[PDB]
From a paper:
MTHFD2, a one-carbon metabolism enzyme, is localized in the mitochondria and plays an important role in nucleic acid biosynthesis, amino acid metabolism, and protein synthesis. It is a NAD-dependent enzyme and functions as both 5,10-methylenetetrahydrofolate (CH2-THF) dehydrogenase and 5,10-methenyltetrahydrofolate (CH+-THF) cyclohydrolase, converting CH2-THF to 10-formyl-THF (CHO-THF). The MTHFD2 gene is upregulated in various cancers but very low or undetectable in normal proliferating cells, and therefore a potential target for cancer treatment.
Compound 9 and 15 show similar activities, despite having different chemical structures and, in particular, different tail moieties: whereas 15 bears a bulky glutamic moiety, 9 carries a relatively small propanoic moiety. To compare the interactions of these two compounds with MTHFD2, the structure of MTHFD2 in complex with 9 was solved to 2.25 Å (the ternary structure is hereafter referred to as MTHFD2/9/21) and compared with the MTHFD2/15/21 structure previously obtained. The propanoic acid group of 9 occupied a similar position to the γ-carboxyl group of glutamic acid in 15. However, the α-carboxyl group of 15 is absent in 9 and thus loses the hydrogen interaction network with Ser81, Gln132, and Leu133. Also, the core of 9 was observed to be shifted away from helix D, resulting in the loss of a hydrogen bond with Arg142. 9 and 15 also have different head moieties: whereas, 15 bears a phenyl-based head, 9 has an indole moiety consisting of two fused rings. The indole moiety was found to extend further into the dimer interface compared to the phenyl-based head, leading to the formation of stronger shape complementarity interactions with MTHFD2 and the additional hydrophobic interactions with Lys203 and Met207. Most importantly, the nitrogen atom on the indole moiety of 9 was hydrogen bonded with the side chain of Asn204, which is absent in the structure of 15 bound to MTHFD2. The more extensive shape complementarity interactions and the additional hydrogen-bond interaction around the head group of 9 compensate for the losses of hydrogen-bond networks observed in the tail group of 15, resulting in the comparable activity of these two inhibitors.
Residue numbers in the entry:
A (entry chain B): 36 to 217, 222 to 279, 287 to 330
B (entry chain A): 36 to 216, 222 to 278, 287 to 330
């Protein structure tokens, strides 16, 4: 039987460290960290995820505010709001929850957030810093995946990692961290493409010690794709009427040596790492 | 028998294209393009390589200088020289040859070159732009790998690509371009040097394209290649110079192959000429 990694437990431990770190930082006389989140429109997933983030902020000692704007906002008002928060010395972290309405250019918005406040690491400069090991702040979901691996003690050096991504924004940053020299796993990394044949993907997963699925299709990762003892980390978000990941949990539970559940796996880790990035931002 | 791709011939053709575009940009009454290359110290590979760059600038009509400085130069001195060239309206392209001496922070140096003059694409925002498909200027060697594949006509949509990386700086830009929606749309593997030949082989035999940038003689042999696959040799091994590939062994099985020397190396220099006309036109 596979070990089932509790994302909740690891996040809870990570959040406890941030509280300790935030409390000491305030005990030295500094301003309490503040995180601002801009939420546009009404994606139910987005509101749910943003509520998780501000809940986690309060219980770790980080002040927070969510600014909700209707979807009919223009790109110019969103830029004015971002520019205001960039200049607010009480605001340490600023993130924009994605996706944005189609009439707004996401890349323009993410590049308008000040790079010192970019707790998501979506600004072009922070993407470059991550590539070049200059960083201060790492994208929360890739860093969350890495902490699951590292804190569980799963070996990466020289190992075979496969990342099944829906987009390059998602699979490449995960791959980059595991490929980086030891954050960084010294691992061989395969990044499967969109619409890649499942059996073509299979010939890569069969070899993998660590399969990381972030494609958003149900049952992409079944037992006939895993060698025994392989760690399987589920990043998929799927509605099928309930939430599931990319892995057939009960099936792969037999074959695999490690498996993360959805919910309760990567999700809580994403939120927890965002807390780490916010204290980092408040410290400069 | 594997068809051998002459990187030299392909690169000389690209330089002819750059030349006409430079000579037309000048005929139209703009300043002739100027490339400045900063060389620190005495690494012989660095000098040979920079020689090939200024020789290519001459052929294609771009003015150029190599500014050679002793290895004892301080970081502050180098930054001051870079700042001067950044502000010199005659300079269009500016690169610092690497490696630099250990008392100079190479990341600080590359991030001090103006991003508009950064014809190597080593400035952090240019690296970020390349990741996010916002760029106008690709690093020369990965872009050269891509032109080879492209002008040869090797298909990449859905194919398996394996890059044998030596550092993250070398294999990952190559993988970035090949995995991207210049696109390429390929399943990409970047192997770390801590994965043995035995496990790397499990990946290379599935690969329609194998790109070796590991700097390890005879890393790629015919057993690791599936029949008909393209093999791009990026490696440099130094009394002769060879690439990572057993050229003779795998010319029997590959579908395409590039030689070392005369393969990726001339493409690197050619693509740098393209980045420099791009920079000159703002
Ligand atoms: C609705 C939505 C939006 C969304 N946007 C999104 N995810 C991102 C990014 C992003 O810019 N970067 C930085 C980066 C490094 C990087 C590198 Cl190193 C190479 C190449 C590209 C790179 N981008 C990321 O790492 N991630 C994870 N964006 C814009 N992601 C999801 C799915 C996962 C989730 O739920 O967050 N959903
Ligand atoms: C001694 C030496 C130094 C050296 N320096 C070196 N090569 C580099 C870089 C670099 O920053 N980038 C941009 C990049 C994109 C990028 C992405 Cl997208 C992801 C991750 C990292 C990334 N870096 C590169 O693409 N390359 C190829 N550097 C600093 N390169 C060689 C081999 C070249 C040769 O000898 O031909 N040798
Ligand atoms: N879109 C973005 N824009 C800007 N920056 C970002 O980081 C994102 N990305 C997210 O915010 N991604 C995210 C996804 C899921 C959770 C999460 O909490 N999942 C739970 C509950 C499941 C549910 O309620 O449906 C679980 O799996 O346990 C948290 C964050
Ligand atoms: N280090 C760097 N710092 C800053 N920007 C860079 O781009 C680099 N990287 C290079 O400059 N890499 C490079 C490697 C080989 C050649 C080359 O000309 N190879 C020839 C002859 C081989 C020989 O003469 O030894 C061939 O293979 O045929 C040219 C450039």
């Amino acid at each position: 039987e596979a070990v089932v990694i509790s994302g909740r437990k690891l996040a809870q431990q990570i959040k406890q460290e941030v509280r300790q770190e935030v409390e000491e930082w305030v005990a030295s006389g500094n301003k309490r960290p503040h995180l601002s989140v801009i939420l546009v429109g009404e994606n139910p997933a987005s509101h749910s995820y943003v509520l998780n983030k501000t809940r986690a902020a309060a219980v770790v000692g980080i002040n927070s505010e969510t600014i909700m704007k209707p979807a009919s906002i223009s790109e110019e008002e969103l830029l004015n709001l971002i520019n205001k928060l960039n200049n607010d010395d009480n605001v340490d972290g600023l993130l924009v929850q994605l996706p944005l309405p189609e009439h707004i250019d996401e890349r323009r918005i993410c590049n308008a957030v000040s790079p010192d406040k970019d707790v998501d690491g979506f600004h072009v400069i922070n993407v470059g810093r991550m590539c070049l090991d200059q960083y201060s702040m790492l994208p929360a979901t890739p860093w969350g995946v890495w902490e699951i691996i590292k804190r569980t003690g799963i070996p990466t050096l020289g190992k075979n990692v496969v990342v099944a991504g829906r987009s390059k924004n998602v699979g490449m940053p995960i791959a980059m961290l595991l490929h980086t020299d030891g954050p960084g796993g010294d691992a061989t990394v395969t990044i499967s493409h969109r619409y890649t044949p499942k059996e073509q993907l299979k010939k890569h997963t069969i070899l993998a010690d660590i399969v990381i699925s972030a494609a958003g299709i149900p049952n992409l990762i079944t037992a006939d794709m895993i060698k025994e003892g392989a760690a399987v980390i589920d990043v998929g978000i799927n509605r099928v009427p309930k939430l599931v990941g990319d892995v057939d949990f009960e099936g792969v539970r037999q074959k695999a040596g490690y498996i993360t559940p959805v919910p309760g796996g990567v999700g809580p880790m994403t939120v927890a790492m965002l807390m780490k990035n916010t204290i980092i931002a408040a410290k400069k």
